[PDB]
């Protein structure tokens, strides 16, 4: 799986911002330098295996498409009822061994590219249909778009996943710690189990009483760290009397069955 995202912000006719990045699985692998119009390789294996000349062709292709995309939108904004300021987001990519290309206007589904042409989302209305008229004006450009999705993109993964799987298949052990959360109500405590630094993403964390999983465990969102690892808080609300013998248990692929077990204990209780 690989995809590219575009964030194009149209603040007024004279002011825009264009942010572009590439993603292998959920990992960021490429960025676009708006100045100098350069593809930036976040990892040594981000170049995949394509030659420097081929990347120049890809840079030129995206550069020209970017210039006439912004110009085309500004030319047709009034016909399309696009009111400044507005944001257009695009995501397109594939899966090796799943082509897609979707476009949003003001944060909602607007059009998508299917097989060989742009199709409007029915709910996006008549302006999405008018937009597809502009996008479908040149079938040859759509054939190139189709080939980017069905030929270039799968080929890019060949030379990207393999060249970097030493990264995507890393195992990084979590660390965990316990703290007090905000108290939920009178006479109750919130126990917080933090789990940090693990990779890959799948993880198991429960508050426990011995072997019994406490089904009040509330698992938060899995949140990113800049080093590529993940973080999560799992909270348990308990009555003040009933916090004895509670532990937080973490299971993760990197641990090879050796779960992290921390105990609500010591100054946390607090003991005497």
């Amino acid at each position: 799986s690989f995809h590219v995202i575009w964030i194009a912000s149209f603040y007024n006719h004279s002011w825009k911002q264009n942010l572009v990045s590439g993603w292998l699985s959920d990992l960021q692998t490429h960025t676009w330098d708006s100045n100098s119009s350069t593809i930036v390789f976040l990892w040594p294996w981000s170049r995949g295996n394509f030659s420097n000349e081929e990347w120049k062709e890809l840079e030129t292709l995206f550069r020209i498409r970017t210039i006439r995309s912004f110009e085309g939108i500004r030319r047709y904004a009034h016909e399309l009822q696009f009111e400044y300021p507005f944001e257009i987001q695009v995501t397109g990519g594939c899966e090796l061994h799943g082509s897609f290309l979707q476009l949003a206007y003001q944060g909602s589904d607007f059009v998508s590219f299917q097989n060989n042409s742009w199709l409007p989302y029915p709910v996006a209305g008549n302006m999405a249909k008018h937009f597809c008229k502009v996008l479908n004006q040149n079938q040859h450009e759509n054939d190139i778009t189709h080939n980017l999705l069905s030929d270039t993109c799968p080929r890019f993964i060949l030379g990207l996943l393999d060249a970097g799987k030493a990264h995507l298949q890393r195992q990084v052990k979590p660390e965990a710690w316990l703290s007090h959360g905000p108290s939920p109500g009178p006479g109750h405590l919130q126990l917080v189990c933090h789990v940090s630094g693990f990779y890959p993403k799948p993880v198991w964390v429960m508050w426990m009483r011995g072997e019994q999983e406490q089904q009040g465990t509330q698992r938060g969102d899995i949140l990113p760290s800049a080093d590529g690892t993940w973080y999560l808080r799992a909270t348990l609300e308990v009555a003040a009397g009933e916090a004895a013998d509670l532990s937080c248990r973490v299971k993760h692929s990197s641990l090879e069955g050796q779960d992290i077990v921390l105990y609500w204990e010591g100054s946390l209780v607090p003991r005497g």
């Binding site: 964030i7 912000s9 944060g107 909602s108 710690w177 940090s196 630094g197 949140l223 005497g272």
Partner: protein, 106 residues
Amino acid sequence: IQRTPKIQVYSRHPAENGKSNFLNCYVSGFHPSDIEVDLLKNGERIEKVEHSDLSFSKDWSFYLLYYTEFTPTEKDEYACRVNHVTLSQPKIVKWDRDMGSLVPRG
């Protein structure tokens, strides 16, 4: 048409006074993409904070990670301050850390 940011603050490692750590503020689920995020130390903005490249989720809402290396001490409070078009006033979310036992017995 507009979506308010979710704001989540966390450290990379358990807080230990005198030990360098990383403070994270994950801002997500918002639209449009224009947003202002600051990490605060004792109510004052921290200089030279890093952030990830802007990205968005499946539902098209945007997200960013702001982060900085820091060394907490006992007297320090940290927070994340976010301003967005959906907010009347900037929203401040604290870094919740546990400072150990309060009442001294020794």
